[PDB]
């Protein structure tokens, strides 16, 4: 069934607004196309399953239509969908651009507020957000390594990236430097292999523990010479003896071999501790 596509006019409409108007005028007929003023928009009492084009996503009018439950998208969504001959998204929430379309994310090991922010900005950039980790997830967003979800995503060979990736995607999109999430390079935003790990060793010679310390710091973790409880997450230990080892065992701290550490570096993520126990 037919549905109107209304363009919200204002005193200072952006370049994106007019660009979307010209592209929709060039790839669809003007029969279901209106231009409405702020007056006519404020007066709308009810959501009429039509599509509104706001810029920016702020102000009395945007707040009004959002409260009514209207299907709102930014002009960059129109330009994108027109250019790639693809459908306008469902838009249960307002969608400002399509930079993160085809991206489905889940989060782990994040602060609640940080997660809500990632959810918000991913939703605004045309991506999808899942609480739990399912097959359709394309990227995991993580603040630390280690969690069950982290490991699951790693076994599926999915990218595990930092919130900074989202931040850069948003900022770079507002600076009109990127059209697509692939324009920035993923590896500059990977989650470090040992981010959140606090590693101690025992039984290793001085050169071994200096190498472990150097690599730990290089790969985002922290190294400790002394074992401190409520701090150390992993004790690297090849042979199960010594005061460090037994203290770690009384505190149920991960006691793993060196193969855990170096395998974690080689395979690009923090390995499952359970396979490397002693």
């Amino acid at each position: 069934e037919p549905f109107f596509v209304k363009f919200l006019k204002s005193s200072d409409n952006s370049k994106c607004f007019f660009k979307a108007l010209e592209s929709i005028k060039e790839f669809q007929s003007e029969e279901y196309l209106q231009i409405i003023t702020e007056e006519e928009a404020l007066k709308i009492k009810e959501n009429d399953r039509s599509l509104y084009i706001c810029d920016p996503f702020s102000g009395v009018v945007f707040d009004h239509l959002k409260k009514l439950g209207c299907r709102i998208v930014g002009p960059q969504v129109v330009i994108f969908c027109m250019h790639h001959q693809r459908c306008v998204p469902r838009a249960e929430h307002p969608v400002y651009n399509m930079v993160m379309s085809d991206v489905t994310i889940s989060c782990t090991s994040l602060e609640k507020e940080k997660r809500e922010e990632v959810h918000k900005y991913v939703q605004m950039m045309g991506g999808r957000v899942y609480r739990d980790l399912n097959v359709s997830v394309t990227h995991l967003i993580a603040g630390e390594v280690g969690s069950k979800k982290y490991l699951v995503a790693a076994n599926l060979k999915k990218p595990i990236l930092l919130p900074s990736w989202i931040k850069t995607l948003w900022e770079k999109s507002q600076e009109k430097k990127i059209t697509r999430y692939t324009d920035i390079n993923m590896e500059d935003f990977k989650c470090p292999i040992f981010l959140g790990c606090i590693i101690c060793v025992t039984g290793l010679c001085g050169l071994d523990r200096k190498e472990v310390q150097q690599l730990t710091v290089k790969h985002g973790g922290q190294y400790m010479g002394q074992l401190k409880m409520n701090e150390c997450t992993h004790l690297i230990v090849q042979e199960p003896k010594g005061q460090k080892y037994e203290c770690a065992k009384r505190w149920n701290v991960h006691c793993v071999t060196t193969q855990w550490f170096f395998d974690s570096i080689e395979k690009g993520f923090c390995q499952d501790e359970s396979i490397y126990k002693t």
């Binding site: 010479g225 002394q226 401190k228 460090k244």
Partner: peptide, 9 residues
């Protein structure tokens, strides 16, 4: 608990 490092033996 806290345990110091194995000294350079």
């Amino acid at each position: 608990e806290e345990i110091p490092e194995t000294p350079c033996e």
